[PDB]
Each structure stands twice: as C-alpha cells, then as structure tokens.
Enzyme design. Structure first.
Site, short mmCIF file in Angstrom:
data_model
loop_
_atom_site.label_atom_id
_atom_site.label_comp_id
_atom_site.label_asym_id
_atom_site.label_seq_id
_atom_site.Cartn_x
_atom_site.Cartn_y
_atom_site.Cartn_z
N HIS A 1 0.83 -1.19 0.00
CA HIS A 1 0.00 0.00 0.00
C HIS A 1 0.87 1.24 0.00
CE1 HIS A 1 -0.48 1.40 4.45
NE2 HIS A 1 0.69 0.81 4.31
N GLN B 1 -7.45 -2.70 9.32
CA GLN B 1 -8.64 -1.88 9.45
C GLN B 1 -9.64 -2.31 8.39
OE1 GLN B 1 -6.97 2.35 10.75
NE2 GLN B 1 -5.85 1.36 9.06
N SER C 1 -6.24 5.60 9.40
CA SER C 1 -4.84 5.97 9.22
C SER C 1 -4.67 7.07 8.20
CB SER C 1 -3.98 4.77 8.80
OG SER C 1 -4.29 3.61 9.54
#
Ligand SMILES: Cc1nccn1-c1ccccc1N
Length: 147
Positions: free
Chosen positions: A43, A115, A138
C-alpha cells in the site's frame, strides 16, 4: 449483472460505460473478470491532519487536509495507471507508512487483522489489481494486491 461489488457507470466526459467497484474504489473501462484465507498486499498511505497518528517517517507533523491527501492519492493513481511511475517507486518515496521502506509491502494477512475498509478492499481486489483511494483511520490508501 456483474460480480458483487461492481456496478455499471457512465463517464461524465465521454458517455462511455465503465465499471466501478464500491469496495475497492477501483474503476475501469472493461467489464470486470467474474475468497482466499489470506491475501498479500502493498500500500501507499497518504496521511492527513485527522489521521489516527498524524506523523510519519516523512514528516514529524502531518498537517495536510484530508482533501489535500486525496488529491495526492489521485495523482499517484494517475501516474501509476499511465505507467510514468511504478507503484513500488511511489510507495517507497511517498507512503506515510513504515512499509514505505519495503516498497509498501505489508506481507500476508487474514480477515480480522487490518482496518476494515482496507481489509474489505484487499480481499475484493483480484491478484495484481490496484484499488482506488481507500479510506481508514490511518489516512488514504492505494492498495495493491500482490498475492
Ligand atoms: C471523500 C472525500 N472527498 C474529499 C475529501 N474526502 C474525504 C477524505 C478523507 C476522509 C473522508 C472524506 N470524505
């Protein structure tokens, strides 16, 4: 219709039909092709002033707005999709995550660990597919499913 998560859409600028996935926020012109215990993802995170921890290896105090973060994410997605830049290069340079030093690699993971919006996008991506902007506490993510 199409596989779950996907819907047909109309380009506002060309009128041509495209497909949008409301779980990954991916969009593409082609009709989409169509779950594992684990997936592996990389990511690129862009944090903002409202991030759970508005700090990163790039910047002790992250001050950019959520809107500014999304604009940066959008630009990175454009460059990745055009091939001017590789996902791994932009992740290494610009991800606000400790995984930047690993070209954004997060390793493999199961449901329950990340998450939830990140998890849902990760597991809905096909192998090798990249997400649109994915929002979590985040910040804003571009997710690449590598396995
Ligand atoms: C979707 C969107 N467009 C502009 C800003 N944001 C946004 C960014 C981060 C968190 C929530 C929201 N709404």
């Amino acid at each position: 219709k199409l596989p779950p998560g996907w819907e047909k859409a109309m380009s506002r600028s060309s009128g041509r039909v495209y497909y949008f996935n409301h779980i990954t926020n991916a969009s593409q012109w082609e009709r989409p092709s169509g779950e594992p215990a684990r997936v592996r993802c990389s990511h690129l995170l862009v944090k903002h002033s409202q991030s759970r921890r508005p700090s990163s290896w790039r910047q002790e105090k992250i001050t950019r707005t959520k809107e500014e973060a999304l604009e940066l994410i959008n630009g990175y997605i454009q460059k990745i999709k055009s091939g001017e830049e590789d996902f791994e290069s932009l992740a290494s340079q610009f991800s606000d995550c400790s995984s930047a030093k690993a070209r954004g690699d997060l390793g493999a993971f199961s449901r329950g660990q990340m998450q939830k919006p990140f998890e849902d996008a990760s597991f809905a991506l096909r192998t090798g597919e990249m997400s649109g902007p994915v929002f979590t506490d985040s910040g804003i993510h571009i997710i690449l499913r590598t396995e």
